[model samples]
Target chain A: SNARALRVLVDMDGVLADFEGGFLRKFRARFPDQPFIALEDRRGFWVSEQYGRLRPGLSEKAISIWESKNFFFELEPLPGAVEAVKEMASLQNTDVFICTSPIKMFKYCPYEKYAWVEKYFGPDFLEQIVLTRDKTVVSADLLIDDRPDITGAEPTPSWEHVLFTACHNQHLQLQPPRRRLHSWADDWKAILDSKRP
Target chain B: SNARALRVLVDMDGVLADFEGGFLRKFRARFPDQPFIALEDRRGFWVSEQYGRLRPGLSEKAISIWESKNFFFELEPLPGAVEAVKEMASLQNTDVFICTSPIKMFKYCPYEKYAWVEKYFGPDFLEQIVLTRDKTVVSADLLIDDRPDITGAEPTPSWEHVLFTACHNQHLQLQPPRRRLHSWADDWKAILDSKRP
Candidate 1:
């Protein structure tokens, strides 16, 4: 076929992995008094900042959860994420890629993310994964990420960014033409629709 | 509008920047006794090993070309790269990206590469550039690189890797399906041809 396939870049954490759930569980285990809550309770991007407001001067140690050996492994797949991605891969005229931002402060972040992808998605998906700090550098037809700024610093971009709904980013108001995916089930449809002329 | 563009990833050093040209010049200035010759005269991937064979135990200092503050800035674009990429960018149904592997050991390699792109290719090309160690991880339709084994340990890959003709890589015989681009003058056509159905 001469037709070009639509390239879709999917985010791993929050969108695929249960990062907030895993982090909250770990935080509660470590500190019983602080009382960690659901993902909706999170108000900021940096988990450190959100935690620091409650417990001052504990930002560095708090973010170390991502650095732990079990951090990535402990994260279960987000609701319908695994199934949705599998279906997306099987869809016609589409190429799926996992785009993730690794923490620069943690040396193990990149490897852990790689191992995690291989474990859940298999070795074939390993080739499709991209580990980078700045998602703006990536150019694709559509980006399904939880961040509001995935388009990077540019006010107008060539590709459309679909905000993968998360509690932390729910506070951000949706702008014109930018869409949001509330769940993986229907979100996959939205992604496919974006490719249609 | 449904037409898909062919995504091309071009290597910086040998394909665009005169990496070998710059290094050899520096090598001759640093150690005149070695009598540096053409890129074909080099036998190994590492300049350290190639130079070390001639002058044993000096690999550490010889490899410092990457570390020098002037390393990236001193490099000039290969004869036709700047003009070639501009044409590539302007071509219909094509997206051009500069994909280069930066030396991980050198702290300044990434920044320097970014700076070099900005200076020569301008801010527009800066957005098109990507710095990574493993080229195999990159997802593109066609990759124009000088290395025969850009895919690392993987014997097969999805993208077609076209060897950008350089004096260093000319000695190696071409493998099945893997083609060589003699020069940028007509090489752009070869790249577009590779994507044709």
Candidate 2:
């Protein structure tokens, strides 16, 4: 019964926390007059990157909303993401780690990221949080993230990239997606099961 | 030329940052009359654990000095630690990552860790910072840390533990130390070179 645990790295923002959902809500509340793109309409990994194009100087506003106090902390967990993560951890020899990257601004992002995990996932999950800018350097069996291109200091990463379905990343794989998770409720078991011994 | 880079996870506190030297300076400045254990005489990992033995309520004072704002950011780098790390990073197909654990009280620790890195290691080193409490999950060829025993969610870590010489850890390995780093100025090349393919 000494099977090695599957070290699966779960991303925070889009995958677990409703980053686009939370940001949209906060942005809409602040500036209903300004143009806003729904979560489905996002075409880029960074919200500010796409939001900036809607109007000049709007990117600052987007940055403000996301980087503001309690923005990351207050993010509602994606439907069943927390439960699925906890459940995945509960499985025999299946280790799920929350591997997240902090924003370059580095003000409220780091502490709030921890706070968000503590709030939704509870205090026990704190030990499971790995905050690194470079995901490629972090060792894991599989890295399930929303971002398509994950490059780091190391040109080659250890873990296989499993894309979590998001509006921004939909342009790739067309209808024929690649190692993608459409929903936390779907195919995660099969995805995880296949990777394990 | 696709040789895999060696991912070496270098620890922050004792290995690179002068935690003991910095803490002693701050603690002495705050409480001049209090009993203090110099670096070598230290018998335990946690400074507060040993400092508290001197008197009641002294543990809180020790904690306050470390946990205070800029305590982590202002920590002077251990002599030649930064230069040696930079040198390691410069070597062929070698990637040295700064994998450090934050204090449980996550108020200023997380951001200050980054700030400290940005200050000493420079902004370029930002990509190499991997902040995780559980080092076992972080894949690396070798984990250079001061802590004697490092355990986490994953029992068997990917990396080999190379003990960085510290006062608290002096009790371990005795004169016959196992994979120990007596000084950054010595033997690191042989240790890292031996690990690479």
Best by TM-score: 2
**Model 2: residues >4 Å from true position, as ranges?**
A1-3, A153-158, A174-177, B1-3, B174-177
Candidate 1 per-residue lDDT over residues B1-197, each given as its tens digit = 01256667799888998888899888778777764556768764566777676656567767776678778668889888888888888777776778787554434555566667777877656667655555654556788888777744223444688888887777788768678888788657766766866
Most accurate candidate by DockQ: 2
Kindly list the per-residue Cα lDDT of model 1 for residues A60-112, writing each as its tens digit: 65787777767876689997998888778777776677877655433355556
The Cα error of candidate 1 at residue A57, in Å, is: 2.0
DockQ of candidate 2 is 0.55
User: Per-residue lDDT of B40-138 in model 2, one digit per residue for the tens?
Assistant: 788878899888898999999999998789899899999889999988888888888899999877889998998888888788888788899888877
Alpha carbon lDDT of residue B138, candidate 2?
77
Candidate 1 regions exceeding 4 Å error are: A1-3, A35-37, A151-156, B1-144, B148-168, B171-197
